[PDB]
Design a protein around this ligand. Sequence first.
Ligand SMILES: CC(C)CCC[C@@H](C)[C@H]1CC[C@H]2[C@@H]3CC=C4C[C@@H](O)CC[C@]4(C)[C@H]3CC[C@]12C
Ligand SMILES: CN(C)CCC[C@@]1(c2ccc(F)cc2)OCc2cc(C#N)ccc21
Ligand SMILES: *[C@@H]1O[C@H](CO)[C@@H](O)[C@H](O)[C@H]1NC(C)=O
Ligand SMILES: *[C@@H]1O[C@H](CO)[C@@H](O)[C@H](O)[C@H]1NC(C)=O
Ligand SMILES: CCCCCCCCCCCC
Ligand SMILES: CCCCCC
Ligand code: NA
Ligand code: NA
Lengths: 218, 542, 214
Amino acid sequence: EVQLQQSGPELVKPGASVKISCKASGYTFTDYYMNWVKQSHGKSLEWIGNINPNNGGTSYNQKFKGKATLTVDKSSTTAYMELRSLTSEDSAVYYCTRSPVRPYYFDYWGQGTTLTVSSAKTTPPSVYPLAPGCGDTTGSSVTLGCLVKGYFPESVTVTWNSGSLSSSVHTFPALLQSGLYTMSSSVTVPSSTWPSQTVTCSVAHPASSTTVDKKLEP
Amino acid sequence: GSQGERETWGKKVDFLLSVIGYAVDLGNVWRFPYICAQNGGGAFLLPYTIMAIFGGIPLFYMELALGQYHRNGCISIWRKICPIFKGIGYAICIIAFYIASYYNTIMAWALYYLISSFTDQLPWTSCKNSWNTGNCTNYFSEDNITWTLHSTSPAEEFYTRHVLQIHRSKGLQDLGGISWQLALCIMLIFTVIYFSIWKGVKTSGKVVWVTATFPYIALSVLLVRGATLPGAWRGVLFYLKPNWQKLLETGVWIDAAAQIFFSLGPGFGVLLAFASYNKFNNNCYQDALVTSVVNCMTSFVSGFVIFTVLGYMAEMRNEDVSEVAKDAGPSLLFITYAEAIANMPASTFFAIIFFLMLITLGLDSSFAGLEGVITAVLDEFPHVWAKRRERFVLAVVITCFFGSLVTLTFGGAYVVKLLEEYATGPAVLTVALIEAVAVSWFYGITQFCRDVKEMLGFSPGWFWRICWVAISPLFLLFIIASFLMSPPQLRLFQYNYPYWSIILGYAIGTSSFICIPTYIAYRLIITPGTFKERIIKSITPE
Amino acid sequence: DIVMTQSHKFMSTSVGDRVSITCKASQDVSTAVAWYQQKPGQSPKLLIYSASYRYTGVPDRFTGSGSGTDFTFTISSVQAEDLAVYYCQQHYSIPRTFGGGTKLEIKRADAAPTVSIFPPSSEQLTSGGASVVCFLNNFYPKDINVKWKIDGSERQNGVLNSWTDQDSKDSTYSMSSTLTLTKDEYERHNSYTCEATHKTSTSPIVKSFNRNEC
Ligand SMILES: CC(C)CCC[C@@H](C)[C@H]1CC[C@H]2[C@@H]3CC=C4C[C@@H](O)CC[C@]4(C)[C@H]3CC[C@]12C
Ligand SMILES: CN(C)CCC[C@@]1(c2ccc(F)cc2)OCc2cc(C#N)ccc21
Ligand SMILES: *[C@@H]1O[C@H](CO)[C@@H](O)[C@H](O)[C@H]1NC(C)=O
Ligand SMILES: *[C@@H]1O[C@H](CO)[C@@H](O)[C@H](O)[C@H]1NC(C)=O
Ligand SMILES: CCCCCCCCCCCC
Ligand SMILES: CCCCCC
Ligand code: NA
Ligand code: NA
């Protein structure tokens, strides 16, 4: 049960600073190096630096010297990384990963932390239901779906009936336009469960902390 | 008169190998390869020579000439040059007492490592010992093993917890008490140096025959051994890989200068004493040139001797030779290299000849080290001393032994670092600067060139004169200023030195040359007449 | 520093085929190469360490080989859930660098795109807008044309195509064509129609609906 739980998404204006946490469990925290890997959108992994939890023995990368600052707390077994002078390039997904001294592999990773560096205002998402017409042909399966328009940044989660069931859910990637994102979701459910039971799509926006739920109606 | 003339050398080759044996030591083996690897690689060869030709060689030759000309000790020679600077001859003495406090103890370790290498199975191979912890993980064990932040190797465990026993101390604060084993070892060493000095230059020219010739043989064996090891090309590559961007840094030049200073060991009076016992018409140029050219070459091949083995070690592990060579100290020899030796056929052999090599690397250098001081005191206090030489030499050796008991403690290595980097070093550089200034700007460089013109039959070239006049004192001045402006942060065995360490080091350092200004004040307060007349009797030879 | 170069940014394979990814390093590495697997939307997962050795909790189908500068990660039996981006990484010199990444796409038989058109909801009409949606589900490959028709006329403005990543169950792509329009313009037209042209059939799939209360 080696688990590495990081902090949530962060939306910060350029020039400011941001701190990311990393709570470790399931292993002896004082036994392994704690690392931080930066992954840009569509790019490769990029090792920032490590830190020795025993004494805080940091080892940064030359590319990140003066860019990132690593700290550690043994009292709660939690690592931290601070970034100052934030720019558009810093807008990426950051991981904190465990690693031994030798051989230096990254055995366990964190779930990641989506960082968005922009001065754009936190816009709440508009949730509009996408119900099939009353003139459509009900076959062996009906396809439902929900639409999300206008929100910032890329931090949204669309679930279906508390994650049950979702064995045919198709989620479409968000598209950015005029500083606002727009995405959509669909689900293929048989005709023997609609509209008999209750099917409700949930749209959560952690950046604006807004959760809107909409039920499909033919 | 009661006594007329002093003794001489038994043979040219004897002292020719004596000075070389003193120049060559531990530092030649492991310090130069490391500092050469991390400062431009092969490109470090360029500033290393420049700091030699302009800095090292002129000081070496200038030091070697005065001794063979005046034939006086480190103390009595100033009475014939600049009496007020006579304190120099005393300062060095005190300096020596500090140096001998640790420089021998190192050898002790090797000795303790040598007497433990007579077993068919070397102690630092297995983990089933009385000093190893539960962290001890060795090879010929389960595969797939993965190293941990707290994990240690049986070699590291053997050095740390057995011989050095540094786990029994919390630092400089609490280091007591003394280990009796290394005490017996250092007693054996203080005994083997006694019988090589007590009879004078007669034995110190004969004992050197073995101590100075053995390391080259052993280095040859280790060379042809390490060359046959698989993946040894990595260490050589890392050893010679040119990093010309390092030459732009003003640091590596200072590193080279300091390095070439300490390897040469001028300005200490040892070369003065060795030169004292020699033919008057004997050549000084060729002697100085040859010896030095060796002290360096020897460093150069020693580099291969180390990096082939470390390359093999990086091959057996997983690369980046810097990782296996992170620690820059005795641990590179006592842990890394030793652990590399343990994993080779005929390990007992390659261990014995290696530690024996270390000991012989140290003694010869330790022979002279005492030899210079003894010569100085005997020449300063003649016929009140020399009643027997064995008495005085014994009186020195025992004193050095009691002075080394602080280093024989559990937290002794800490003291070694502290004394070697914060105390003795900058003081030797300082007194070397004082000598370089005194001979060139007080006694006169012209008269010196005239003395050389008397000995060699011809006046030294402009290339050397211009070096003694300006290049050398600035050469030392640069190093001294570089150190004093930013003393290095000391670290040893996962232990950072306290902030007050520099205060203690400087305290020990300053207490060494308290004698020169107070002696200047002594003669200045003793000599009657005007202060200008006193300084005139202090500037003019006696 | 060290440059881990993956020449092939993308590689195609089928379910059950043998696939191998190459990794080129700057200098000689001996046997210090690690292979990580990163599924779309998840964190990287260590599969191979030290050239050939497998990590704990890794299936037998994942292997590793190589010794020097060129290294190879081999998969014997490709599964639908093996769909991920694979990375190689050196672990000898500081700093630790990674490869470009090889996105392993799965090749299979063609599939007919289930097209489904959807009328603007009343909740969107309340705010004062209307977007007709055209979903394209379960097809292969990714290359597919989408043409819109408001009232027989080819609509091209206000159309957004969104392609998802490949599927990890049946390996089928899916896309969404969105036609965003105003309420005023929406209430001036009745029957919308979206059509899709794929390689499965020469005749484009046509879906249509009426605004007059379906
Ligand atoms: C050889 C003589 C002349 C040197 C004496 C200089 C004095 C002032 C120096 C030398 C050693 C130094 C001490 C070294 C040890 C300690 C213990 C530490 O917990 C407080 C600082 C303290 C107390 C230092 C204070 C300053 C100190 C006492
Ligand atoms: C220079 N060559 C390599 C020998 C080194 C040994 C050394 C030496 C001097 C007195 C002794 F009793 C024993 C040994 O000679 C001079 C010297 C200066 C410093 C400084 N700072 C440190 C050590 C020594
Ligand atoms: C191993 O080392 C750690 C710290 O280095 C120490 O806490 C632990 O007690 C050691 N193990 C044993 C069995 O002594
Ligand atoms: C591999 O090494 C690790 C070191 O932590 C160990 O936990 C693991 O059990 C080893 N693998 C096997 C199969 O024993
Ligand atoms: C590299 C220096 C070897 C000798 C170390 C002695 C400490 C004093 C040196 C001060 C100048 C660096
Ligand atoms: C200037 C050196 C001062 C040292 C104090 C002991
Ligand atoms: Na030397
Ligand atoms: Na020697």
